[PDB]
């Protein structure tokens, strides 16, 4: 992403929506739900807060943080070796290898009995109130505005309180701004293209940056001169 | 002269994936998972935007500099041959 | 005689990117990230402008000067051969 994620409070979107006379029954309560829906539907990883938090494994099981949404990595605390996805169907079940993990709810199922594991996860940036905090990018703001307007107009169209042409226009505009917002947050910046370039050109390919925390992924590959 | 350049659009890289790690696994496996049902493709899928956005392939900044280079090399061969002939010193007569 | 010339339109260089650094990384990686959902493409995507603006490839100022050069070289070979014959001095008889 080229631009920086400067955070602003949620009613910034209600400042802009309520300019429309047909959206004056919208509320913070509705904006919260539709904002969370938009955040998930776009799935942008720059909108989440990166956190690292250690936990203990009692026996092939560990308690997971409260605010976790998605895991970047899990690794062993003492070695630093990363874990992979668990493909085993009988992990801690005995009868009569490398470490891996599997997470469903508040519980992470590892293949290790008693160790500390480090989890690098993504959460939502919250407010002084326990509420979501949105980027102030006017592209993001316009796209979220258009998302909420599209949902409200879809309800009102299901009633027959909006013309089909009005909803068709709203859907067209939301679709274009959704694509544009997707490209805004995903296209790398200059530093991210230097990292991608140093990942791309290897005379000797590097294929083991998962073992580390992808630390050396964008490190330049130097060849000595002979 | 640089190689061909591909114009790559990242509108289908799956959600929650960095471009760097996506491309890294594409290198390793030669297979890149994409997401045709991203929110950014909603207009094209639902018919609100031009369908060329989910199609049309990837563009190329190709310049035909190889043909120019071949032409110059052939001209060099011709001129060296003609100098050899006018000097009265053939290629077979140098070696 | 100069090489082929490509007509490059920069309407899809991503936002906040200079043309120089964009082209520099395109050189290095042979891959140029573009942005199909730029504000300048809104008309073509939404159907308000001709769809050729998001399509049609890149044009070429190509001149067929190589064929002319080959014709002149062949004529030179023919004339030198004919002078050799009329003089009674064949190529095999010079070497």
């Amino acid at each position: 992403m080229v631009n920086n994620i400067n955070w602003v409070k949620l009613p910034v979107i209600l400042d802009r929506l309520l300019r429309h006379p047909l959206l004056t029954d919208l509320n913070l309560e509705t904006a919260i739900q539709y904002t969370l829906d938009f955040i998930s539907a776009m799935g942008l990883p720059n909108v989440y807060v990166d956190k690292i938090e250690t936990i203990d494994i009692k026996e092939y099981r560990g308690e997971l943080p409260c605010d976790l949404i998605s895991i970047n990595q899990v690794r062993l605390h003492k070695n630093g070796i990363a874990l992979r996805a668990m493909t085993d169907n009988f992990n801690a079940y005995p009868t009569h290898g490398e470490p891996s993990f599997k997470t469903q709810g508040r519980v992470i199922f590892t293949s290790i009995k008693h160790e500390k594991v480090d989890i690098s996860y993504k959460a939502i940036m919250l407010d002084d109130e326990g509420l979501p905090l949105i980027p102030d990018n006017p592209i993001f703001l316009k796209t979220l505005e258009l998302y909420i307007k599209k949902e409200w107009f879809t309800i009102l169209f299901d009633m027959g309180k909006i013309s089909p042409a009005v909803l068709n226009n709203t859907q067209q505009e939301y679709a274009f701004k959704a694509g544009q917002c997707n490209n805004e947050f995903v296209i790398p910046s200059v530093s991210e293209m230097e990292a991608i370039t140093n990942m791309w050109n290897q005379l000797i390919p590097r294929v083991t940056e998962f073992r580390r925390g992808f630390k050396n992924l964008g490190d330049k590959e130097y060849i000595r001169v002979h | 002269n640089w190689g061909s350049i591909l114009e790559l659009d990242l509108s289908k890289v799956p959600k929650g994936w960095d471009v760097g790690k996506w491309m890294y696994y594409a290198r390793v496996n030669h297979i890149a998972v994409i997401d045709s049902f991203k929110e950014g493709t909603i207009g094209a899928s639902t018919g609100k935007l031009a369908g060329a956005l989910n199609n049309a392939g990837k563009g190329m900044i190709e310049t035909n500099i190889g043909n120019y280079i071949q032409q110059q090399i052939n001209l060099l061969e011709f001129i060296k041959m003609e100098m050899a002939d006018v000097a009265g010193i053939s290629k077979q007569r140098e070696g | 005689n100069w090489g082929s010339i490509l007509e490059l339109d920069l309407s899809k260089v991503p936002k906040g990117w200079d043309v120089g650094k964009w082209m520099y990384y395109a050189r290095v990686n042979h891959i140029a990230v573009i942005d199909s959902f730029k504000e300048g493409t809104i008309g073509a995507s939404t159907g308000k402008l001709a769809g050729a603006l998001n399509n049609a490839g890149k044009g070429m100022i190509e001149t067929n000067i190589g064929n002319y050069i080959q014709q002149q070289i062949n004529l030179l070979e023919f004339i030198k051969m004919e002078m050799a014959d009329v003089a009674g001095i064949s190529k095999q008889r010079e070497g």
């Binding site: 068709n168 | 018919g47 935007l49 | 159907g47």
Partner: peptide, 4 residues
């Protein structure tokens, strides 16, 4: 309608 949808033809853009």
């Amino acid at each position: 309608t949808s033809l853009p």
